[PDB]
Amino acid sequence: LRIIWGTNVSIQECTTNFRNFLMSFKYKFRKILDEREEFINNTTDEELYYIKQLNEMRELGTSNLNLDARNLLAYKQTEDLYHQLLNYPQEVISIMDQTIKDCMVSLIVDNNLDYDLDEIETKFYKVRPYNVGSCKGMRELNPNDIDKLINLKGLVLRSTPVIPDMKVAFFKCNVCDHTMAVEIDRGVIQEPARCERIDCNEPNSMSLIHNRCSFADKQVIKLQETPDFVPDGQTPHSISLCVYDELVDSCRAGDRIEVTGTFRSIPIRANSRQRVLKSLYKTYVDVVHVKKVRQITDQDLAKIREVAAREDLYSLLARSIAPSIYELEDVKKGILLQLFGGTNKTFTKGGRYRGDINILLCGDPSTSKSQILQYVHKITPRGVYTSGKGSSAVGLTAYITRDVDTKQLVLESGALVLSDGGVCCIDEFDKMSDSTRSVLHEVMEQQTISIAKAGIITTLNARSSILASANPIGSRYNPNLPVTENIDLPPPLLSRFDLVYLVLDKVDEKNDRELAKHLTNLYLEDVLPVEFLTMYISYAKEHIHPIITEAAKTELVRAYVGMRKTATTRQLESMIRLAEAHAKMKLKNVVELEDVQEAVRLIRSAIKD
Amino acid sequence: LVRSLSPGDIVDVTGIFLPAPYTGFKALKAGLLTETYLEAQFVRQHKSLTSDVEERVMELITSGDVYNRLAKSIAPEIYGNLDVKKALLLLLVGGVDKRVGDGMKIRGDINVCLMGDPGVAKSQLLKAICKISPRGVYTTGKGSSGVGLTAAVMKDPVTDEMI
Amino acid sequence: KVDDVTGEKVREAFEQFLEDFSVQVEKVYRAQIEFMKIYDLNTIYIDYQHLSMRENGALAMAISEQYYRFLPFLQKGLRRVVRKYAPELLNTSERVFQISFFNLPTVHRIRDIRSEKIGSLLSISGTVTRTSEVRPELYKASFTCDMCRAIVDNVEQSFKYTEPTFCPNPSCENRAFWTLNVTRSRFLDWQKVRIQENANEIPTGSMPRTLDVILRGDSVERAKPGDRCKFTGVEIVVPDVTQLGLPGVKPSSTLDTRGISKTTEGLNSGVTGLRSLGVRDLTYKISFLACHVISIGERDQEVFLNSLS
DNA sequence: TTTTTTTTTTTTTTTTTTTTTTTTTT
DNA sequence: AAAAAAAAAAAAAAAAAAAAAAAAAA
Ligand SMILES: Nc1ncnc2c1ncn2[C@@H]1O[C@H](COP(=O)(O)OP(=O)(O)OP(=O)(O)O)[C@@H](O)[C@H]1O
Ligand SMILES: Nc1ncnc2c1ncn2[C@@H]1O[C@H](COP(=O)(O)OP(=O)(O)O)[C@@H](O)[C@H]1O
Ligand SMILES: [Mg+2]
Ligand SMILES: [Zn+2]
Ligand SMILES: [Zn+2]
């Protein structure tokens, strides 16, 4: 009957229409609405999409809804709310929450169970509508749609810390020490005039207790117009976004998001002291829904086990990591062994012993090493792909820098620290400067980086693995001259790499034809897992820790001695790491003869080059 | 009338020329000096798939000698270097950009470098090619930094925030 | 005057906890008070786990939720315990006492700081990146009326220089023009430290978040830059005192050298209405106040023989 | 090898003016 | 109702000079 002042929305019909919508709607009505042909009605027409989500939310206890606009328009009688929400979002959403308040009761007592409902009474619910209408950029927003729901798209530039907002004031009397709480409306606090206590009753005896009030959380986000839609010779524009309650700390910096929210405009004061305002408002949006652009199940465990039970797991993931790369199976073997890494240990007396494998690729200038590095970048969980051509001498480690937004101090870690526990890929290793090289030296020796600047003395943790690619001086790597002259790298730096591979390119009719054939076949338009590798890698790296047995002793000692029939002691610690990394593959819990045989074969084929 | 004007347009704008109040700070020093502005009321800018363009391509096909004539008409002032003019045409068009599965990508863009002794019409040829395609930028030496200026800081005077 | 009933229950419960715990019968807290008496110390240490077994957490959760309002009663009960069992620790050569809590069950990161824990007892962890000088803070002020020469003492101050309002003698009529007796007033040590998030809690791409932690009393200089420290205390909120009418003309109504953010111009919700503010708008920000700090990241024969067992 | 060459890095705000518009104070 | 006093309002920044390093060569 009665209508909220100003608008035309009435609660009475809206509540009834919404309950009819929820208990009545199914995928049947949705597929009748869209009816785009080839629409599946296989038992979906009776699934009761809303009621099942309602029940699963009740049993979970979480309050999150994804009501859509097209689905809201689907029902004939509730079509009024579709055009009644775009123009008055706040009141319709207030009705929304009020109806969801008893949507719980409508289903908890259908069978008269023993749910408490008291925690339901205390907790509150809300909605997150999306796909309200056609998406329009910030470059087309008039004052004609203020306080109306819109959908925007843009790049996230920055976020601000949590902002307190007062809800309930708290005043204490300095004479009688009486406490009373005053609600605030739209920001303004209505001051208490005199103490309510009739006996006390003193004028001007009020004191505000700042830390005894009640506060809520706010966040402000900054967006930028996407470069695709901008026209020629223009500068991108910006919009500020208000985020409240559960949605705070959701949008990371640099992401691109599409949001739904209410456009709004407020005045800003001309003079700081005076009451005066200037005749030009500022425009922003209050957001209600945000969209962007571990915990493996038991079935995943079973499929991992059965795949691990394969006869030849080595070759399959040898070919999977680099589908495009043809031949070069040996370097892929080495990279597959590197991605697991030997076990890591730190006993009290001896100290920490390294368990990371370092690989250097070098050779003729027009092979495919860069694509190989960009392949291994994606597979590994946490890693960084940055070239060593330039940048700061401590660009891979901590660099104390002045903050840009605030005139303060921030400690920013580098790329080696940010690749902790993973594989760090370095490109153009030969162009890295003589002064920054020493930094890597402390990374590959002690696995820690120390910074002592601006009154800060501290140490970080590197614990990463280095895969690097380099280029020689000239157009070919002539085998006659030894490695040292061509690669332009210090002998210790080359020596400390666990595996060094030489990629050669010789004019061979068979090889040239075979390469060109599959290259053209790839350009011609006509056994590789997609994400199994990442989960298998995580499982092997986070749960599995092999050990060594005397069977490895017998082979390892005699193999090292036979290699000593100019193999430094580094060689044996390289064989142990490779053998223990192979043991982590073909899932096991202990090393045997096969692992040490594969490791020695790999390290001697490396010697052959 | 809002949004009728965009940066980089030569236009003839009509309106009322009015004095701004110049109040607030720094008004006292001026005393009787005022700003000014123009309230705009009219705009006169000085300067697709349809059957017309469907027939233009057919006419040019019936003309014949498309390759040689297209190369030749590029900068008719400069006499010679006809093979260079053939190659600039291939640079104007673009090769296939095919997105191969599993992450592989192949480029179709053209990289053409023109070396040679000074005083051979080096730097008219280039400028002239910029006219043909609307999406093009002529970047020069260290006088300005635009090739690698992918900066994340912009001290715009209007608001003093980064862009 | 209006008094509280829950505060009285907390005050008596704390006295019972101090007097009765004795679990090792050793009277561990009475042993600590004796050690303070003999060594002349000014701070006590209370473990949470020790308190986590009396009243089945009824006292512990009550203290944790509303530490800010219950601290005055805890100190009042401690005063009575000290008077009953060790009067010597009641006067100096009175010692402003401090209570240090530690061993909380769960630890928080800097990105879990929300306004709904303001006033609660928490523990946080972070890496120190800046420390300031040990400045003296005004604790108990003392003034003299200009005309009567009457002396007022123990004028509490919250966040700004607060002078008394009514003269001790109602015969005098005076609203202002006092003279601080800097000699009689009590002072305390004050330090501000800046901390940021740890290297592991930082996401893959992130600009680290920061916080302002206030160390006071005996806790000064215990956190050094570059170290990783675990703080514990109470989460508070700090207003902008410049627009609260500071006495001097030196503030000059928010003099600035840099430009404030235009994005948050009018977006930062400021409350108005209060008479002290006038037509101004008061703003708030979240800071931390710490009571206990821990770190998580002599060739003389006679003195050497003493330390060893 | 000891000479020349080269980037580059803070250096910056402490002051102003008479109106115009606000609060106190006889 | 009519006086005397007291702050806001700054904003701004490129362009040049001097000194110490970290890469080049007769
Ligand atoms: N083939 C040619 N046809 C016509 N004019 C030519 C030709 N070759 C050179 N020129 C002349 O050379 C000039 C255009 O090139 P210009 O010498 O100005 O620049 P550039 O080749 O980039 O050399 P620089 O190194 O001096 O900048 C004009 O004077 C033009 O007449
Ligand atoms: N063995 C190969 N398999 C597939 N493509 C190859 C192979 N060798 C060379 N290529 C081609 O040559 C190019 C190599 O470029 P890249 O290796 O990234 O440059 P860089 O020499 O700087 O590492 C790629 O575009 C790739 O298509
Ligand atoms: Mg030229
Ligand atoms: Zn009262
Ligand atoms: Zn007096």
The 3-class secondary structure across chain C, one letter per residue, is: CCCCCHHHHHHHHHHHHHHHCCCCCCCHHHHHHHHHHHHCCCEEEEEHHHHCCCHHHHHHHHHHHCHHHHHHHHHHHHHHHHHHHCHHHHCCCCCCCEEEEECCCCCECHHHCCHHHCCCEEEEEEEEEEECCCEEEEEEEEEEECCCCCEEEEEECCCCCCCCCCCCCCCCCCCCCEEECCCCCEEEEEEEEEEECCCCCCCCCCCCCEEEEEEEHHHCCCCCCCCEEEEEEEEEEEECCHHHCCCCCCCCCCCCCCCCCCCCCCCCCCEECCCCCCCCCECEEEEEEEEEEEECCCCCHHHHHHHCC
Could you check: is the Cβ of residue A276 within 7 Å of any atom of nucleic acid strand D? yes
**Closest Cα partner for A133 from A69, A90, A76?**
A69
3-state secondary structure of A360: strand
B108 assigned ligand-binding residue: no
Torsions phi, psi for A481 (to 5 deg): -75, 145
Regarding the domain delimited by C107-135+189-240+283-297, which CATH topology (the fold level of the hierarchy) does it fall under? OB fold (Dihydrolipoamide Acetyltransferase, E2P) (2.40.50)
Distance CA A284, CA A265 (A): 6
What CATH number has the domain spanning C2-87+94-106?
A: 3.30.1640.10
| Count of positions (residues) in chain C | 309
* Matching residue, tokens 């057919």: B58
Distance CA A42, CA A27 (A): 10
For A314, the enclosing helix (H) or strand (E) is: helix A313-320
**CA to C1' distance (Å), from B25 to E9:** 5
Q: Could you say which ligand is closest to the alpha carbon of residue B114?
A: 1
CA distance C207 to chain B (A): 14
Residue A98 corresponds to which tokens in the numbers above?
Answer: 């009020």
Q: Do A382 and C204 touch (CB under 8 A)?
A: yes
User: How far from B1 is each of A145, A265, B11, B13, C101, CA to CA, in Å?
Assistant: 18, 22, 14, 12, 68
CA of B125 to the centre of ligand 1 (A): 9
Distance CA C183, CA C189 (A): 16
Mutate to test the interface with C, among B154, B156, B158, B159 (most CBs of C within 10 A): B159
3-state secondary structure of A553: helix
CA of A170 to the centre of ligand 4 (A): 14
Q: Do B161 and A233 touch (CB under 8 A)?
A: no
**Residue whose CA lies nearest to ligand 2 atom number 13:** A368
Contacts 24+ apart (CB under 8 A), A439-443: A439/A393, A439/A394, A439/A396, A439/A397, A440/A396, A440/A416, A440/A466, A440/A493, A441/A492, A441/A493, A443/A396, A443/A397, A443/A416
Distance CA B50, CA B58 (A): 13
> What residue type is assigned to position C70 of the chain?
F
What residues have CB less than 8 Å from A489, skipping those under 6 apart? A429, A430, A470
Top mutation candidate among B117, B124, B138 for ligand 1, by most atoms within 8 Å of CB: B124
**Closest Cα partner for A97 from A131, A61, A72, A65?**
A65
Q: Do A522 and B100 touch (CB under 8 A)?
A: yes
Q: Do B161 and A378 touch (CB under 8 A)?
A: no
Sign of the Cα pseudo-torsion (A294, A297, A302, A303, in order): negative
**CA to C1' distance (Å), from A447 to E13:** 45
User: How far from A449 is each of A45, A111, A392, CA to CA, in Å?
Assistant: 62, 64, 15
User: How big is chain A by its Cα radius of gyration, in Å?
Assistant: 33
Nucleotides of E under 7 A from a protein CB: 6-14, 22-23
Could you check: is the Cβ of residue C262 within 7 Å of any atom of nucleic acid strand E? no
Could you check: is the Cβ of residue C257 within 7 Å of any atom of nucleic acid strand E? yes
Report chain C residues whose CB lies below 8 A from the CB of A252.
Answer: 203, 205-206
Sign of the Cα pseudo-torsion (A230, A231, A232, A234, in order): negative
**Closest Cα partner for A581 from A538, A544, A528, A534?**
A544
* Matching residue, tokens 């901590």: A398
Asked if B106 reaches chain A (Cβ–Cβ under 8 Å), the answer is yes
Torsions phi, psi for A178 (to 5 deg): -100, 140
Residue A562 corresponds to which tokens in the numbers above?
Answer: 């036979």
Q: Do A238 and B102 touch (CB under 8 A)?
A: no
Hey, which chains touch A, using 3+ CB pairs under 8 Å? Answer: B, C
Residue C244 CB: number of other CB atoms within 10 A?
16
> What residue type is assigned to position C187 of the chain?
F
Angle formed at CA A506 by CA A336 and CA A485, multiple of 5 degrees: 80
Task: Name C194's bridge partners.
Answer: C130, C212
For A330, the enclosing helix (H) or strand (E) is: helix A329-340
**Closest Cα partner for A424 from A381, A486, A458, A362?**
A381
Residue C24 corresponds to which tokens in the numbers above?
Answer: 């090792």
| Residues A380 and A339 sit within 8 Å (Cβ to Cβ) | yes
**Residue whose CA lies nearest to ligand 1 atom number 15:** B121
| Residues A153 and A226 sit within 8 Å (Cβ to Cβ) | yes
Distance CA A160, CA A249 (A): 9
Asked if B77 reaches chain C (Cβ–Cβ under 8 Å), the answer is no
Residue B146 CB: number of other CB atoms within 10 A?
11
| Count of positions (residues) in chain B | 163
**CA to C1' distance (Å), from A273 to E3:** 24
Q: How far is CA A19 from the centre of its chain?
A: 38
Q: Could you say which ligand is closest to the alpha carbon of residue C174?
A: 5
Residue C155 corresponds to which tokens in the numbers above?
Answer: 């004028």
A370 assigned ligand-binding residue: yes
User: How far from A297 is each of A77, A330, A584, C26, C307, CA to CA, in Å?
Assistant: 43, 34, 21, 52, 57
CA of A165 to the centre of ligand 4 (A): 27
- Domain ranges across chain C: 2-87+94-106, 107-135+189-240+283-297, 136-188
Hey, which chains touch C, using 3+ CB pairs under 8 Å? Answer: A, B
A227 assigned ligand-binding residue: no
Resolution value (Å, 1 decimal): 3.3
Residue A468 corresponds to which tokens in the numbers above?
Answer: 């690097």
Residue A446 corresponds to which tokens in the numbers above?
Answer: 């002690």
| Residues A207 and A174 sit within 8 Å (Cβ to Cβ) | yes
Mutate to test the interface with B, among A235, A284, A385 (most CBs of B within 10 A): A235
